[PDB]
Design a protein around this ligand. Structure first.
Ligand SMILES: *[C@@H]1O[C@H](CO)[C@@H](O[C@@H]2O[C@H](CO)[C@@H](O[C@@H]3O[C@H](CO[C@H]4O[C@H](CO)[C@@H](O)[C@H](O[C@H]5O[C@H](CO)[C@@H](O)[C@H](O)[C@@H]5O[C@H]5O[C@H](CO)[C@@H](O)[C@H](O)[C@@H]5O)[C@@H]4O)[C@@H](O)[C@H](O[C@H]4O[C@H](CO)[C@@H](O)[C@H](O)[C@@H]4O[C@H]4O[C@H](CO)[C@@H](O)[C@H](O)[C@@H]4O)[C@@H]3O)[C@H](O)[C@H]2NC(C)=O)[C@H](O)[C@H]1NC(C)=O
Ligand SMILES: NS(=O)(=O)c1ccc(C(=O)N2C[C@H]3CN(C(=O)c4cc(OCC5CCOCC5)nc(C5CC5)c4)C[C@@H]3C2)c(F)c1
Ligand SMILES: [Ca+2]
Ligand SMILES: [Ca+2]
Ligand SMILES: [K+]
Ligand code: NA
Length: 805
């Protein structure tokens, strides 16, 4: 209920909201339907427009006017933004050449530079270049400040999940806003764009910037704007708040614009009608910058210009209909559009089976414009599984397309020419970042980065300690002139054993049948030192990975590779090796095919065996260091050690073999050597975090051998590719993947063809950051380089995406 009986006089745009049923005067009262009767009259003045003219210069203050051109206006902080331009002969901020801001140049009383976050819905990254001619203020922010060529949103590339990611530093699966539309089965409640429910606090997890600020004693402007408050009035309010005296004036502010997204949906990303919304956004930026300049704050405030996602061409006729696939279409609920989420219409239906729905949706038409997944099988880089609001069945929709349940949903709701929501590596979904102010660098370009990193940098800009989040704090240190955050490497928890020769061959009963009987003084001091670490400098280039949890493990040295062997999981946690540009590929010789040899450094108790694989009709095995790449046929025997073996489904073996036999050598030719680190991942509860031993759901039949959910590789080389990977003097280059370990290749529709037609495409889909592999393994890489730690943190967050420029 609301008793709107009181008055808004003196309270216009209130920083501390009051409680029901007393009437409100804050920037959100409208959207709650609760403002005092006189709110519009007093707080939403429109008289005489948004600009001073010659004649208004030194008018007598008339309290009805939208803004003022009277002598007193500056100390009152309510001049029109162009006052000093029209009435005092000053220039527009955009016409001033840029000059480096080396220190904050603030009025007395400011304890820190304020932060203004100017967010623009649907602002696609390519607008910075394609609209440059019609956005002079933005262009100046961009070229004078620090900017990225683009910024990667989170999946799904929808509005609420991204604004809330920007607020919190969390993936949607952690902050809870997993879509623009949601059902929470624990609450039995629905969240919708339209309507009241979205205001309930139980939807919104983590801790957003404004709470972080409040809890550490920094005052926050109110971030949220009711749709009907015109842009010019939002800018005026922020300028007025910045005039407030020392202990009242907020230190952080947000402006939000509904454009260019509103027009993007109607006309497409580059519709001719899109020039005007771009012009209007730049004009608003101009008003803010002229306003700050009048207040002498244009060299004091840090400004961030930032989008939530881009925009793609999408039309009614590019819709796939599940009614063309499923005979049971009235038994399901679908969240439709640029993604698909499916659940049972009724949980009392015992006929609803996910498995057969997925099967009926798999590679059914030859150019199908979506692909079905169980949520745990989605690319791990999307981090989109661990929340009860995300349905088990997901559809990833091709760019430019929609999915819907039935034709009648699409004509009884062509309307739209643009939409967004697709896979967050898609080029049309990329968005913008510019930072301008004393704390940002001057005229600097930084490489593209993910929006999950910004909350940490906004906390750095404000002197706040961030709540725990998914950013990697210090990876964006290169954007900042000062206030950088200096982290330390996490401490190693478990120290490795270094076992010698401790077991005889006859202590093992592996049931393999290896041929290995072939027998020298010169070669045996040399194969000895290879077991003690002489080529380790070649194969372990950046130090051994640190293990950050409590476990029992062994370092194993060989001529061609080094590994960290887990006695608990009965396989390597990691296997490291370097393949030079000159390396030769040999084939597997038949005397050795099903040969697997005991490793005399490791007990039969802590080893795998061949018998379990022979009994398991589904499961076969492969090797982490590839026998195809061994340096000499004496070294090739190390490749067949029981301690280099891992469980693999025959369907996965086709992917792994092609990677190891064809792709590795290719990457070495192209990159001038590569160093490869490979291993298993166990994520049975799809939380993105290393499993403990008691979370493993599947073992090789009749053994203690755990089955990985995924296999990773991290492939590193010199950024300057004229130096070889093993003698690199400067910055590094990296690409990685996390391949799902699946019993079939149903994910790849073309898998009956040769591997050179589909394997590499699958790898590209499952590209990964080093940091994703770290969360999934509890390991820390690149411990020993000659680079700064901040540069290494940037390297670890890098994602190789496989889109053109
Ligand atoms: C991305 O960054 C984030 C942020 O750091 C990372 O997520 C964190 O992961 C931590 C480790 O898994 C986790 O720590 C746990 O905290 C539990 C306490 O939970 C509450 O308190 C915190 C603190 O303020 C709060 O953040 C939580 O908020 C969640 O819950 C509600 C939803 O119900 C939402 O409002 C909110 O959005 C958020 O949801 C998200 O996280 C939860 C998991 O907590 C998911 O279920 C949701 O889907 C969603 O993703 C909470 O309100 C605590 O219970 C945990 O302790 C258990 O496990 C330990 C192991 O140490 C064991 O010792 C304990 O005894 C306990 O186990 C007992 O309970 C079990 C189950 O109830 C039971 O089976 C056992 O028998 C045991 O008796 C744990 O310490 C932290 O909560 C989240 N934080 C956030 C914000 O999500 C994330 O990992 C990063 N992602 C990647 C890929 O790196
Ligand atoms: N996707 S679509 O279907 O086309 C689509 C769908 C719906 C709308 C819509 O009605 N609006 C009206 C807008 C008002 N608004 C905010 O005021 C706002 C700003 C903000 O800002 C968070 C800051 C955090 C720091 O980084 C910058 C933003 N955070 C939040 C939320 C996370 C807590 C809200 C965003 C609302 C979406 C739309 F417009 C497009
Ligand atoms: Ca949006
Ligand atoms: Ca896990
Ligand atoms: K088998
Ligand atoms: Na297939």
């Amino acid at each position: 209920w609301t008793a709107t009986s009181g008055s808004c006089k003196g309270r216009c745009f209130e920083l501390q909201e009051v409680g029901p049923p007393d009437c409100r005067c804050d920037n959100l009262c409208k959207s709650y339907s609760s403002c005092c009767h006189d709110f519009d009259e007093l707080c939403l003045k429109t008289a005489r427009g948004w600009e001073c003219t010659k004649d208004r210069c030194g008018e007598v203050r008339n309290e009805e006017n939208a803004c003022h051109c009277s002598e007193d206006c500056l100390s009152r902080g309510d001049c029109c933004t162009n006052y000093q331009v029209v009435c005092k002969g000053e220039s527009h901020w955009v016409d001033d050449d840029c000059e480096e801001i080396k220190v904050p140049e603030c009025p007395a009383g400011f304890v820190r530079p304020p932060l203004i976050i100017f967010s623009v819905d649907g602002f696609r990254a390519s607008y910075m270049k394609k609209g440059s001619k019609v956005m002079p203020n933005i262009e100046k922010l961009r070229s004078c400040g620090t900017h990225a060529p683009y910024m990667r949103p989170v999946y799904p590339t929808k509005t609420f999940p991204n604004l809330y990611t920007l607020a919190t530093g969390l993936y949607p699966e952690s902050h809870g806003i997993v879509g623009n539309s949601m059902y929470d089965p624990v609450f039995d409640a629905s969240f919708h764009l339209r309507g009241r429910e979205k205001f309930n606090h139980r939807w919104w997890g983590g801790q957003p910037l404004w709470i972080t600020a409040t809890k550490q004693g920094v005052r926050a402007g109110t971030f949220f704007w009711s749709v009907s408050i015109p842009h010019e009035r939002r800018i005026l309010t922020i300028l007025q708040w910045l005039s407030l005296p020392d202990n009242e004036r907020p230190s952080v502010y947000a402006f939000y614009s509904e454009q260019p997204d509103f027009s993007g949906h109607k006309y497409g990303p580059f519709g001719p009608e899109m020039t005007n919304p771009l012009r209007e956004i730049d004009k608003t930026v101009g008003q803010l910058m002229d306003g700050l300049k009048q207040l002498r704050l244009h060299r004091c405030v840090n400004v961030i210009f930032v989008g939530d996602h881009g925009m793609e061409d999408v039309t009614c006729d590019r819709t796939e209909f599940l009614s063309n696939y499923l005979t049971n279409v009235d038994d399901i609920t679908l969240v439709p559009g640029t993604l698909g989420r499916i659940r049972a219409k009724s949980i009392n239906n015992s006929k609803y089976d996910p498995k057969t729905i997925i099967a009926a949706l798999t590679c059914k038409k030859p150019d199908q414009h979506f692909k079905p997944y169980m949520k745990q099988h989605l690319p791990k880089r999307l981090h989109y599984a661990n929340n009860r609001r995300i349905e088990d069945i997901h559809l990833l929709v091709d760019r430019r397309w929609h999915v819907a349940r039935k034709p009648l949903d699409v004509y009884k709701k062509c309307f739209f020419q643009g939409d967004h929501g697709f896979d967050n590596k898609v080029n049309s979904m990329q968005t913008v970042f510019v930072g301008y102010g004393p704390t940002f660098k001057y005229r600097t370009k930084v490489p593209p980065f993910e929006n999950i990193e910004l909350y940490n940098v906004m906390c750095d800009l404000l002197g706040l300690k961030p709540a725990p989040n998914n950013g990697t704090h210090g990876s964006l240190n290169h954007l900042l002139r000062t206030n950088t955050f200096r982290p330390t490497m996490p401490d190693e928890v478990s120290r490795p054993n270094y076992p010698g020769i401790m077991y005889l061959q006859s202590e093992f009963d592996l049931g393999c049948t290896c041929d290995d009987k072939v027998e020298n003084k010169l070669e045996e001091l040399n194969k000895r030192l290879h077991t003690k670490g002489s080529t380790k400098e070649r194969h372990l280039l950046y130090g051994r990975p640190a293990v950050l949890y409590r476990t029992s493990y062994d370092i194993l040295y060989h001529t061609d590779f080094e590994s960290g062997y887990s006695e608990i999981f009965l396989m390597p946690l990691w296997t490291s090796y370097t393949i030079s540009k000159q390396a030769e590929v040999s084939s597997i010789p038949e005397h050795l095919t099903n040969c697997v040899r005991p490793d005399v450094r490791v007990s039969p108790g802590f080893s795998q065996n061949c018998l379990a694989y022979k009994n398991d009709k589904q499961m076969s095995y492969g090797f982490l260091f590839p026998p195809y790449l061994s340096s000499s046929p004496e070294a090739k025997y190390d490749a067949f050690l029981v301690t280099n073996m891992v469980p693999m489904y025959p369907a996965f073996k086709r992917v792994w073999a092609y990677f190891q036999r064809v792709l590795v050598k290719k990457y070495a030719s192209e990159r001038n050597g590569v160093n490869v680190i490979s291993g298993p991942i166990f994520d049975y509860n799809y939380d993105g975090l290393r499993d403990t031993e008691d979370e493993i759901k599947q073992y090789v039949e009749g053994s203690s051998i755990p089955v990985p959910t995924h296999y990773y590789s991290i492939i590193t080389s010199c950024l300057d590719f004229t130096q070889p990977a093993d003698k690199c003097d400067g910055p590094l280059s990296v690409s990685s993947f996390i391949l799902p370990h699946r019993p079939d290749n149903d994910e790849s529709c073309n898998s009956s063809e040769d591997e050179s037609k589909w394997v590499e495409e699958l790898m590209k889909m499952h590209t990964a950051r080093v940091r994703d592999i770290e969360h999934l393994t509890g390991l820390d890489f690149y411990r020993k380089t000659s680079r700064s730690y901040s540069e290494i943190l940037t390297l670890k967050t890098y994602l190789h995406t496989y889109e053109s420029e």
